[PDB]
Amino acid sequence: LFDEVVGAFLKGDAGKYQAILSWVEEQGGIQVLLEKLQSGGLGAILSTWLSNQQRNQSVSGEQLESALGTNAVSDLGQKLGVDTSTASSLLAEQLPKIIDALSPQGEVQANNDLLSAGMELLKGKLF
Numbered sequence: 001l002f003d004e005v006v007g008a009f010l011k012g013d014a015g016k017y018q019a020i021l022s023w024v025e026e027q028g029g030i031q032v033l034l035e036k037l038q039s040g041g042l043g044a045i046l047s048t049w050l051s052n053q054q055r056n057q058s059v060s061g062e063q064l065e066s067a068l069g070t071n072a073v074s075d076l077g078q079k080l081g082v083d084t085s086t087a088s089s090l091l092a093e094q095l096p097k098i099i100d101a102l103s104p105q106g107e108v109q110a111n112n113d114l115l116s117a118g119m120e121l122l123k124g125k126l127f
C-alpha cells in the first residue's frame, strides 16, 4: 500500500488525457458516448458543445454519470485508480472541451480512430 499511495500522490492527474482517450475507444467510440448523452436527456447541453458559435454549457459529474451510466464512468475511474465521482468530475470538465474540439464544423474521423482525428485537428492548427 505504501508505494501505491506515494505513487498516486506524486502522479496527481498526470496521464488523464491518455486515459480518457483510451476509455472513449473502449466504450465503443465517441459516437456511443454522443448517443448516450442524447438518450439521457442531455441533447440540448450537447448541442451547445457541438456548435461552432456558442459557448459550452456546463454539465455536472452527476449529470454525466446519469447519462453515461455508472459502469461506463467507473470504467474510466478504474483506469485512473480513482472513484466514480472523481472520474465523473474529470469528465464534466474535459468532455465538453473534447466534443467542442472534435466539431469545428458543428458536428463530430473521430469515431473510427480518435487519436488520428485528434492528430488531424492539431495539424489543422499548424496548417
Ligand code: NA
Pocket: 070, 071, 072, 074, 075, 078
Ligand atoms: Na466498471
